Amino acid sequence: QIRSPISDSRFAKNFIGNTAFYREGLENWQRGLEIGMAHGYFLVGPFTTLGPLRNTPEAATVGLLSACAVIGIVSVGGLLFGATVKPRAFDKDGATAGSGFTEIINWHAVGGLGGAGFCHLLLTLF
């Protein structure tokens, strides 16, 4: 609970607090979708270039496939975490332990696929 400007200034409180993982008014699926879109759009990057098939016409497609694979693997890991730990930090009233976190991870997988596809689209075009 120590106070530091990096972790207790108003910018930090309203920045981490307004992220998808913490933003008020967001359903679990919205948080998952937003985090997934961010992760998927990021992950296409380091694969299309800096990869085995760099200097090939299908570099963007291979990067997209690898980014989707990484999103799927981390989503399986998140499902594993929700099945084992059941974080319970996002569950609504009643429901079951870890339902909110599992929904977040599933929609993170969906958003990761979406963001990876969007990055691949923006690479093939323009």
Partner 1 sequence: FEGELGVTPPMGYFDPLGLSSDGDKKTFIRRRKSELKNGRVAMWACMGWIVPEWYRFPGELSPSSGLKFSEIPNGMAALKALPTEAWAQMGAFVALLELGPLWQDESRAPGDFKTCAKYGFPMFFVGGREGSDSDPVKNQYSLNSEINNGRLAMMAITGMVFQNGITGTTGPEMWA
Partner 2 sequence: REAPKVLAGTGGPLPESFWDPAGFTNNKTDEELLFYRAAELKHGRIAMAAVVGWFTNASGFHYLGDLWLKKPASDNPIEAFNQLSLLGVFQMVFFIGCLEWLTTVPCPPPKDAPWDVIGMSDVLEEDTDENPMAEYKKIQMQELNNSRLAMVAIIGLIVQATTTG
Ligand X SMILES: CC1=C(/C=C/C(C)=C/C=C/C(C)=C/C=C/C=C(C)/C=C/C=C(C)/C=C/C2=C(C)CCCC2(C)C)C(C)(C)CCC1
Per partner kind, with CB cut-offs from 5 to 8 A, the member of ligand CLA, ligand X, partner 1, none near residue 72 is ligand CLA
Residue 35 identity: I
Judged by CB under 6 A, does residue 87 bind ligand X? Answer: no
**Binding segment (CB under 6 A) for ligand X, from list 34-42, 60-68, 71-79, 84-92:** 34-42
- Contact letters for partner 1, residues 10-49 (x by CB under 8 A): ---------------x------------------------
Q: What is the DSSP string of 86-118?
A: ---SS--SSS-TTHHHHHHHHHHHHHHHHHHHH
Residues 36 and 108: beta-carbon distance below 8 Å: yes
